[PDB]
Design a binder for this molecule. Structure first.
Ligand SMILES: O=C(O)CCC(=O)C(=O)O
Ligand SMILES: [Cl-]
Ligand SMILES: [Co+2]
Ligand SMILES: [Co+2]
Ligand SMILES: [Fe+2]
Lengths: 294, 285
């Protein structure tokens, strides 16, 4: 079977965009160096070690207590917020992918851990958080991109993501056979990029030695789509320590859907949100050198 | 020609919903009493009295200077924020209309004032703010509702909204004639309700001398769609003074698109936004 293509970080962006259109998915090999990955895993370990709260938890309360989940990792994991989330290759791909849609931002990024002995997910499309996506025709400009970070090894045995190449062109998911899919076997620091409507499934984890498979799932959506996670409660000091791009990803700035929206979105007082908030950013001084950068 | 149906404010919501699916629009007679209209007009006069600003204006700068415009009137006009925005008839309609898509909220509510001698808009559908709406099939759950508040009288001369009934079923706008439309002639306190995909046009204002025509346009959208105006800079005191319904409309609470979304949207820390913020509300201890 034709396999997922693995591309280095300096690969051609037009090529990556065409892989998304033809295959529906590809892998960035070794995008994140091992020390970034392990610093991220460490930050994630701290979050998972927090004791269970007494209050309501919207997703977690629907699952048994062994459910392993860290929501909105950008607020508790500085490595994701300051390094992974603003990676320039990821954003080069997003800008090409979202060219017909306009601006994009982060809808969600969260950890899942899949224990030994777990079965494989059913094949599905990622059209449930924003159900209107189910009715978008294939020809419409895409409004969502799934970006998948393996934080342990993904192998055939521990449940590497199953992707059915070309399936974004299918009318319905139906009930595909597992052998129609190819495996996104990867090393931590690789990244899997999956186009909207592509049929896929988590592979579960069929190892028996008790080693979980860890994954962070990020959804970059058209700014027309409401973020699943709202980063509005971040403290100002944390927000201002981010770059402009990171503030844009986390909903703190006015954004621009494609024409025929000629104005923008996420604004107030007919002004940009960042101006009403007088928001500073870490790389403002580099983006405005001679004071005439408009 | 069939005209826009005028309904008493206490008409049956099943009748309103049927008019939206057959005609695509209808008028509510005297929904807002005179004191509400007058209170609202007072508050909008204070905003109109603000001098032209010294900086960028994202919307207004795209248009000629005879553009009169007050953005996000919920943050400056208490009568809209705590009375009009939470009108139980509007919301009865919204709940019925959005039943297939789930929760809705306020994408924008703003004032426009149309001067004498202004030409009509071309016929259009309101699918420009969220361009993805252009590609949704007719049969898909609607994600947007237009709610139009005349704040002066709407007459044939001063540019009452032109609405083409049943045109939500057209595959495209085409090149329709003005006589295919009917006029939303109204008195202050009435409300015009327009379904997604309905071809319509602002009438401009072809009076020759007279007070400008004044209208507040409110867009209620599925909570799946990012609000055009963000109300997140409202003071905590102002937010907590509102009802739960008001806070939900202005984006301060976790909301719920229809299944298969089984968790919600606009949340954080796997908790409701209002619980993370410890938000009080007027009608909620
Ligand atoms: O990565 C996996 O194992 C499943 C990923 C997935 O289902 C998704 O990104 O929607
Ligand atoms: Cl703060
Ligand atoms: Co999925
Ligand atoms: Co319009
Ligand atoms: Fe004619």
């Amino acid at each position: 079977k034709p396999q997922l293509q693995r591309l280095a970080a300096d690969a051609d962006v037009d090529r990556m965009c065409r892989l998304l259109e033809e295959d529906g998915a590809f892998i960035l090999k070794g995008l994140l160096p091992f020390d970034v990955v392990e610093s991220f895993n460490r930050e994630l370990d701290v979050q998972m070690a927090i004791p269970p709260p007494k209050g309501e938890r919207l997703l977690a309360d629907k699952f048994p207590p062994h459910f392993k989940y860290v929501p909105n990792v950008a607020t508790t994991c500085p490595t994701f917020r300051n390094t992974v989330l603003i990676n320039p290759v990821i954003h080069a791909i997003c800008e090409a992918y979202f060219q017909r849609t306009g601006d994009y931002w982060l809808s969600a990024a969260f950890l899942r851990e899949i224990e030994s002995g777990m079965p494989a997910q059913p094949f599905h499309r990622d059209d449930a958080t924003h159900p209107l996506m189910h009715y978008q025709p294939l020809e419409a400009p895409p409004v969502s991109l799934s970006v998948i970070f393996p934080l342990t090894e993904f192998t055939e045995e521990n449940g590497a993501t199953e992707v059915i190449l070309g399936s974004h062109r299918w009318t319905e998911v139906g009930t595909p056979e597992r052998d129609q899919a190819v495996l996104a076997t990867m090393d931590p620091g690789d990244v899997l990029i999956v186009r909207q409507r592509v049929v896929h499934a988590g592979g579960g984890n069929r190892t028996t030695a008790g080693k979980p498979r860890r994954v962070v799932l990020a959804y970059f959506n058209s700014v027309q789509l409401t973020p699943f996670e709202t980063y509005r409660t971040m403290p100002r000091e944390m927000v201002e320590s981010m770059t402009v791009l990171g503030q844009r990803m986390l909903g703190w700035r006015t954004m621009k859907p494609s024409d025929p929206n000629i104005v923008g979105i996420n604004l107030i007082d007919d002004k940009r949100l960042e101006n009403v908030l007088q928001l500073k950013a870490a790389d403002s001084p580099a983006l405005e050198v001679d004071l005439q950068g408009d």
